Design a binder for this molecule. Structure first.
Ligand SMILES: CC(=O)N[C@H]1/C(=N/O)O[C@H](CO)[C@@H](O)[C@@H]1O
Ligand SMILES: CC(=O)N[C@H]1/C(=N/O)O[C@H](CO)[C@@H](O)[C@@H]1O
Ligand SMILES: [Mg+2]
Ligand SMILES: [Mg+2]
Length: 433
């Protein structure tokens, strides 16, 4: 029961790349079928591909008009990637999508990423007329990351997150504020080091109070999200980067999506340290990542074969960087990404990844009762014209299906399937008096 109670989530990068309501519905269908609990839909991730009906934003002592914010975001997204399939989901489409998922017992968790992976928002701010929103590192400007010294750019971004969080209030549980990979383009993936550097290496031109300002920013977004009754979530890499607790403390109410154990020269906090600090953890192990278009061995990092191997070899309970500690989890999340958003989206490949994650951790995933429900619906309603003996058999087989534990896992699917087969057999054996 502890296993089935955890979240099982599929994540889809619909920030970089357009996904239609139809495509997303198909993903929800498969998520439900395979025993998942939630769809994690990035809508702000480099591109920004979700537009509310009212996008007016009040910040910087004015209001930026809804139609101007919309045009600025559409344009800004296209400058990142002008997807021939579409630009953004509308509010009507999102509301319907959330309802469609809810009716299948699937939750939706959105991400609108900042202060990194926000290319489109930075573009949109410039189109509105806000100056120099981008972070720069010794003359190299980030296309993805806002400068936390820029009060006007920061105020706008916070007000945009508030606007989205207000929409998602009461229709979702968790809002992912992201926070991953600060200035990864401008700093060669050393952005957290750069933000912390001035404290330890002063008078060398590193950003003054960089990391301290990042903690304040993260905590302000957390406050914003919490005000709407949503649980804030964020990726782990910048949270106590280098295990450094001396700059300040992160809001404990931020759920940590633990996706990386770090790499050479990129020393992230262990999941042990994060749990000890009082954060709940969603295991988002990059062992299971799939980047669209990288479809076989040799086709690059996070290719489909690598992800399928990661799923086979790294269970849902194996969290990045545990230090050998027992790390509790709220659930696990397998993620598909669109780093090259011109890549073809292949539903079958995504569904293979999803199916493998479910099968490899089958005790955690809900069983499928849909065919059992259908089988019961197909039983002839009136049995009077059949022999007592053949009728009793059908009634007992029906009882057997209705008696199944309603909380079986995917590991126990055969119990359900055998019960369906028995009912079908007894119905075919009904004999006219
Ligand atoms: C908003 C919406 O379309 N809801 C439908 C639905 N959402 O998943 O599928 C159910 C069947 O599974 C239908 O009974 C619901 O009417
Ligand atoms: C939290 C996270 O996963 N961040 C990035 C990532 N960094 O290595 O890997 C993915 C796959 O390349 C990218 O799509 C993500 O934007
Ligand atoms: Mg650009
Ligand atoms: Mg009926």
């Amino acid at each position: 029961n502890e296993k089935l109670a955890k979240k099982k989530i599929v994540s889809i990068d619909a920030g970089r790349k357009y996904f239609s309501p139809e495509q997303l519905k198909e993903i929800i269908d498969k998520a439900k079928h395979y025993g998942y609990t939630d769809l994690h839909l990035l809508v702000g991730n480099d591109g920004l591909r979700f537009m509310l009906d009212d996008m007016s934003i009040t910040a910087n002592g004015k209001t930026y008009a809804s139609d101007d914010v919309k045009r600025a975001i559409e344009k800004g997204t296209n400058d990142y990637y002008n997807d021939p399939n579409g630009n953004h989901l509308t509010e009507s489409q999102m509301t319907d999508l959330i309802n469609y998922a809810k009716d299948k017992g699937i939750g939706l968790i959105p991400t609108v990423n900042s202060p990194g992976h926000m290319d489109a928002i930075l573009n949109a701010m410039k189109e509105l007329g806000i100056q120099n929103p981008n972070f720069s590192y010794f003359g190299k400007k980030s296309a993805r990351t806002v400068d936390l010294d820029n009060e006007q750019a920061v105020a706008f971004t916070k007000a945009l997150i508030d606007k989205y969080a207000a929409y998602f209030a009461k229709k979702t549980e968790i809002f992912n504020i992201g926070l991953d990979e600060y200035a990864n383009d401008a700093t060669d993936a050393k952005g957290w080091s750069v933000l912390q550097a001035d404290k330890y290496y002063p008078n060398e031109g590193y950003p003054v109070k960089g990391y301290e300002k990042f903690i304040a920013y993260a905590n302000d977004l957390a406050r914003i999200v919490k005000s709407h009754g949503l649980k804030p979530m964020a990726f782990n890499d910048g949270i106590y980067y280098n295990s450094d607790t001396s700059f300040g403390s992160f809001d404990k109410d931020i759920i940590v999506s633990m996706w990386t154990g770090g790499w050479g020269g990129y020393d992230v906090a262990s999941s042990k340290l994060l749990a000890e600090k009082g954060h709940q953890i969603l295991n988002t192990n990059d062992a299971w990542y799939y980047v669209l278009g990288r479809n076989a061995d040799g086709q690059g990092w996070y290719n489909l074969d690598q992800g399928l191997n990661g799923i086979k070899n790294t269970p849902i309970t194996s969290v990045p960087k545990t230090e050998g500690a027992d790390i509790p989890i709220i659930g696990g999340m397998v993620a598909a990404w669109a780093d090259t958003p011109s890549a073809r989206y292949s539903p079958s490949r995504l569904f293979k990844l999803m199916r493998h994650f479910a099968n490899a951790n089958a005790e955690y995933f809900a069983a499928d009762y849909e065919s059992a429900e259908q089988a019961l619906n197909e039983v002839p309603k009136d049995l009077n014209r059949y022999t007592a003996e053949s009728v009793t058999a059908v009634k007992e087989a029906e009882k057997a299906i209705r008696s199944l534990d309603s909380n079986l896992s995917r590991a126990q699917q055969d119990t359900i399937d055998q019960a369906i087969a028995k009912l079908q057999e007894t119905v075919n054996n009904l004999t006219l008096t």
